[PDB]
Write a protein that binds this ligand. Structure first.
Ligand SMILES: [Zn+2]
Ligand SMILES: [Zn+2]
Ligand SMILES: [Zn+2]
Ligand SMILES: [Zn+2]
Length: 242
């Protein structure tokens, strides 16, 4: 039903050049896979006012677009037209396997970044796999070979809280109630705190940051496409990291 918020046409206008020959993931990410994945997380794009629902979709696609961007300053249609260009960590990467009796690593497998949110480590592939009913510890490559599974891992991240961090979904739909600690840290509801949730240790609270700006660029472009206002507190330049 997320299709009632974002049409196939709008989805492609947003992720405009993802299938250009220069992109590693060309041909991978499809609108039908996105819609199928969304069906497994009913609340996504279906919680709150029509505007909250549009921002929920735009923010999700904007943050994931930054994580997989292939854009550059003078890119065709701007740097914010190049999200979803990659589907797996570039380079030699690493094993990303840490001791865990709850989410044991499978021999010979590696848990490097895969998919829209660049899911990493066995302790994340484990709970994400359980959430979607797929054994991602034994078959982590499915996050880079099956687009529906790929999108599902990203939505799992979007919809899952990591207390004290709320889920990004809760923040964008206006369901997050900041603690006294959050208020003291300057973490107010908005797109900015979502960036903080995702990679605040490295990007937030130290003034202007090009990574934060790139995330906002995607968000504003996508909100413009769906026809919704951005909401407040878009940056995390002055927010203490979670
Ligand atoms: Zn299409
Ligand atoms: Zn193109
Ligand atoms: Zn690690
Ligand atoms: Zn810093």
């Amino acid at each position: 039903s997320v299709s009632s918020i974002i049409s196939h046409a709008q989805f492609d206008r947003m992720l405009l050049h993802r299938n250009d020959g220069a992109c590693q993931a060309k041909g991978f990410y499809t609108y039908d896979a996105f819609v199928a994945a969304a069906n497994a997380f009913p609340g996504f794009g279906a919680t709150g006012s029509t505007d909250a629902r549009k921002r929920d979709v735009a923010a999700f696609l904007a943050q994931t677009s930054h994580e997989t961007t292939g854009g550059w300053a003078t890119a065709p249609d701007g740097a914010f037209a190049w999200g979803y260009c990659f589907k797996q960590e570039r380079g030699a990467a690493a094993d990303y396997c840490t001791p865990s009796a709850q989410w044991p690593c499978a021999p010979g497998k590696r848990y490097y970044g895969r998919g829209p949110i660049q899911l990493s480590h066995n302790y994340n592939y484990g709970p994400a796999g359980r959430a979607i009913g797929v054994d991602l510890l034994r078959n982590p490559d499915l996050v880079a070979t099956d687009p529906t599974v790929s999108f599902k891992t990203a939505l799992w991240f979007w919809m899952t809280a990591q207390a004290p961090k709320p889920s990004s979904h809760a923040v964008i739909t206006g369901k997050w109630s900041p603690s006294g600690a959050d208020r003291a840290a300057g973490r107010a509801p908005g797109f900015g705190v979502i960036t903080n949730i995702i990679n605040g240790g490295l990007e937030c609270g130290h003034g202007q940051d090009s990574r934060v700006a790139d995330r906002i660029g995607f968000y504003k472009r996508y909100c413009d496409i769906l026809g919704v206002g951005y909401g407040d507190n878009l940056d995390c330049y002055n927010q203490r990291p979670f």
